[PDB]
Amino acid sequence: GSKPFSLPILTLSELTNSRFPVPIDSLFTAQNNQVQCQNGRCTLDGELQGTTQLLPTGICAFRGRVTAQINQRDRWHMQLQNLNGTTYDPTDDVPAPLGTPDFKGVVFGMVSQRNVGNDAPGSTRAQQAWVSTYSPQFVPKLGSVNLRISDNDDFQFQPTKFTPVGVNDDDDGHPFRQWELPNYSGELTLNMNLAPPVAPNFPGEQLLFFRSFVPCSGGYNQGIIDCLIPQEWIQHFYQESAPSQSDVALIRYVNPDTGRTLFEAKLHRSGYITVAHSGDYPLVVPANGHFRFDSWVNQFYSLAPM
């Protein structure tokens, strides 16, 4: 006697990217080439994995205290807390504090401070900041990241929040690479407690992504960030905790006014989608369209071509 699995009923423009805090723009299927993102990872029965947490406002955000500065470009040393303000434990079974960026590049946004304690408590300030995940001081698993900021003369050793706005390539030839994980513990250390890599395991199938074009801060980068499942699905699965009756859920993309099924896809137990197609392809489908759960199938189910 099992609680029925389901998806939330949401159009693309009603969905949030689970790897960057912006709406989904489109669906995209990619040729097979290793996909192992750590944000936007959740099993169909509601187990969050990787660095995945529940709030869109937490994705690629940091919270903590600035405690030091060094004479490097990555100047300001931020000791991290968990996003809910609780003390971060580096021995926890996670790759990094939940919400940590899961790509190589620079995240730009703003830092804000609000003093506590004896030194002008309640005083505030905010300004533009950058976090490079290429940096040798990007060591969130160990408990800290270093920030670049706009105004070094108006910044204190106080509680600090980083609010992400967009991404970009780093200079000196460090490109934005959305499928390359940072070294969460820095140079010469292996990432651990990772959500596993995902790939199609059936001939003729490709991954399907929920794609966003996020803001960039200069140059011509398209700002592409692809996620496996949107944040609202993760939030839904976490609530429902419906048992998975097989390794594969058949889902269908439906147009609610016509009632027609446009195509079908495989939603795998570990939380990603495959479709039957060959080649890079941006889908062009009706604005009111959405996936619905059809039934439980297995690994040997052959998808109708997309």
Ligand X SMILES: CC(=O)N[C@H]1[C@@H](O[C@H]2[C@@H](O)[C@@H](CO)O[C@H](O)[C@@H]2O[C@@H]2O[C@@H](C)[C@@H](O)[C@@H](O)[C@@H]2O)O[C@H](CO)[C@H](O)[C@@H]1O
What are the residues binding ligand X (CB under 6 A)?
A: 123-125, 153-154, 218-219
- The encoded tokens of residue 102 equal 């899961």
Contact pick of 26, 28, 30, 54 for a second copy (by CB under 8 A): 54
Integer Cα distance of 39 and 297 in angstroms:
27
Examine residue 211 and tell whether it contacts a second copy (CB under 8 A). Answer: no
Q: Which is nearer to ligand X, 9 or 120 (CB)?
A: 120
Examine residue 134 and tell whether it contacts Mg ion (CB under 5 A). Answer: no
Q: Where are the beta strands (DSSP E) in 57-136?
A: 62-69, 76-81, 106-114, 124-132
Examine residue 152 and tell whether it contacts a second copy (CB under 8 A). Answer: no
Helix/strand/coil for 79: strand
Nearest residue to 222 via CA among 231, 211, 233: 211
Helix/strand/coil for 235: helix
Choose from ligand X, a second copy, Mg ion, none: what does 222 bind? Cβ within 5-8 Å by kind.
Answer: a second copy
Contact pick of 31, 72, 123, 295 for a second copy (by CB under 8 A): 123
Integer Cα distance of 164 and 23 in angstroms:
14
Contact pick of 175, 204, 213, 256 for a second copy (by CB under 8 A): 213
Q: Which is nearer to a second copy, 34 or 86 (CB)?
A: 86
The residues in 265-294 that bind a second copy, with binding defined as CB under 8 A, are 287
Nearest residue to 198 via CA among 43, 36, 90, 42: 36
74: left (phi over 0), alpha (psi -120 to 50) or beta: beta
Examine residue 296 and tell whether it contacts Mg ion (CB under 5 A). Answer: no
Contact pick of 11, 196, 292, 295 for Mg ion (by CB under 5 A): 292
Contact pick of 85, 175, 204, 243 for a second copy (by CB under 8 A): 85
Size of the site for a second copy (CB under 8 A): 49
Nearest residue to 137 via CA among 184, 81, 177, 204: 184
Residues at the site binding Mg ion, with contacts judged by CB under 5 A: 6-7, 292-293
